[PDB]
Design a protein around this ligand. Sequence first.
Ligand code: 0TL
Ligand code: CA
Length: 181
Amino acid sequence: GSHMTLTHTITIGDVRRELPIVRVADDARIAFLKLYGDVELTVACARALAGRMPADVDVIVGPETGGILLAHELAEHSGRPYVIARKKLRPNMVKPLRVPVQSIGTPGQQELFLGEDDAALIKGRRVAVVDEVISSGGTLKALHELVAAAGGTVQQVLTVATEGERRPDVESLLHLPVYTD
Ligand SMILES: Nc1ncnc2c1ncn2[C@]1(CO)O[C@H](COP(=O)(O)O)[C@@H](O)[C@H]1O
Ligand SMILES: [Ca+2]
């Protein structure tokens, strides 16, 4: 006569967290990673990922919202510039590049954008793509497409966690299983 409060333990260096295992579909729960509100976890993840980012990387690119904190802290740690691909058109965007994000929960709607200034910062550079979690990979594919459309090359993919499928072409800190409902 009560609801589940099950958790999944992660450890980034010696930052330990208990991720709540929460329902997201008829038949599925995930260990939910919350960087918002957690400076210690955010900085530890960004430090660990920067340790894995080679000197070849020119620029960091992350999506709104899952790459905001990580890209900022990676850039602050490494000295590399970074770019956020936005979810909405903003008035400072002239001639934006746009890609659809493949998504199972609600197709068609999801989009990522680069203004021509963001794009001018990516053109011709080696890019590390970063996002907090990679699950289906739709977000990651859309970022690949945006980076290609802007003239850059994805050299590395950085994430705190893969989820569901394991991804050996990805630099991740851990793997999160998907749980039943
Ligand atoms: N366990 C999770 N804890 C936090 N956030 C998660 C988790 N699993 C997926 N996410 C998010 C949001 O739902 O999914 C995006 C990628 O989804 P995709 O690879 O299919 O395109 C990420 O940016 C991230 O925000
Ligand atoms: Ca900082």
